[PDB]
């Protein structure tokens, strides 16, 4: 139930170098 | 992974290496979905036309890895297998339909900074994210190019590789290949026109295609790397097992045999 | 599964730590 949250990224409040690309794809097209 | 890059450490903590004991080799990728369960493609474990039928004792799962070849003492965990569960309608005879397998670890692994499970999608999440144009991420230690093309030596990566790819409309997937594409597969990759590149390749198969939910900030495994016609060719796309379609089978197995 | 060089992988002990 704690799945999908990466200790080194989401739990600390840090983004990886390319996840932004994914979110842009959900919104821009 | 072709045209990918080095993963940041801990970037994909559900990534699992399916490791052959004798002879020592990377067989496939895989994903950690709970403390006792690992998800992969069936063709990694079973494909009789190449006399392939791995038993539990033939393999090890290695979790928390970053390096391909090294023993990473302060990070990785090695587990043995208790039981392989293959989808009973897995169609190796024709098109690798329902290419999905589960592996029960003999002992539960403790989670860590480097070891942490991916979520499996629900109906809402699947409806929301599995759309043409939307990108997921694929990771693995498979080859950097098709074998026997370009330069041999630089074929295997030093460290885990990651690439992001867009889901492709069903008509284009279908029109891209002669193989019978079913609703248990979807496909991903850039189009020749789109001037970006990338693909899963030999050794990455069985590993996860993941998407990050903007509703709750979680990574969900939407697909399992299944098959392709070569790696990273124009007009070709990678095909992925549609994890949500088969989620009922995954939960049926885990509820029955998860202690 | 079609991916390796010779003497490639570091040996893996039996550790639980």
Numbering used by the authors:
A (entry chain A): 1B, 1A, 1 to 14, 14A, 14B, 14C, 14D, 14E, ...
B (entry chain B): 16 to 36, 36A, 37 to 60, 60A, 60B, 60C, 60D, 60E, ...
C (entry chain C): 12 to 28
Paper text:
Among them, thrombin (factor IIa) plays significant pro- and anti- coagulation roles. Like hirudin/hirulog, variegin targets the thrombin catalytic site and exosite-I. However, unlike other naturally occurring thrombin inhibitors, variegin interacts with the thrombin prime subsites in addition to exosite-I. Variegin has several potential advantages over hirulog-1/bivalirudin: (i) synthetic variegin (s-variegin) contains only L-amino acids, while hirulog-1/bivalirudin has a D-Phe; (ii) inhibition by variegin is about 9 times greater than hirulog-1/bivalirudin; (iii) the cleavage product of variegin (MH22) remains tightly bound to thrombin (about 400 fold stronger than cleaved hirulog-1/bivalirudin).
In contrast, the C-terminal fragment MH22 V(11MHKTAPPFDFEAIPEEYLDDES32) remains bound to thrombin after cleavage. At the same time, the distance between Nε of THis57 and Oγ of TSer195 increases to 3.60 Å from 2.79 Å, breaking the crucial strong hydrogen bond needed to form the catalytic charge relay system. This explains the observed classical non-competitive inhibition for MH22.
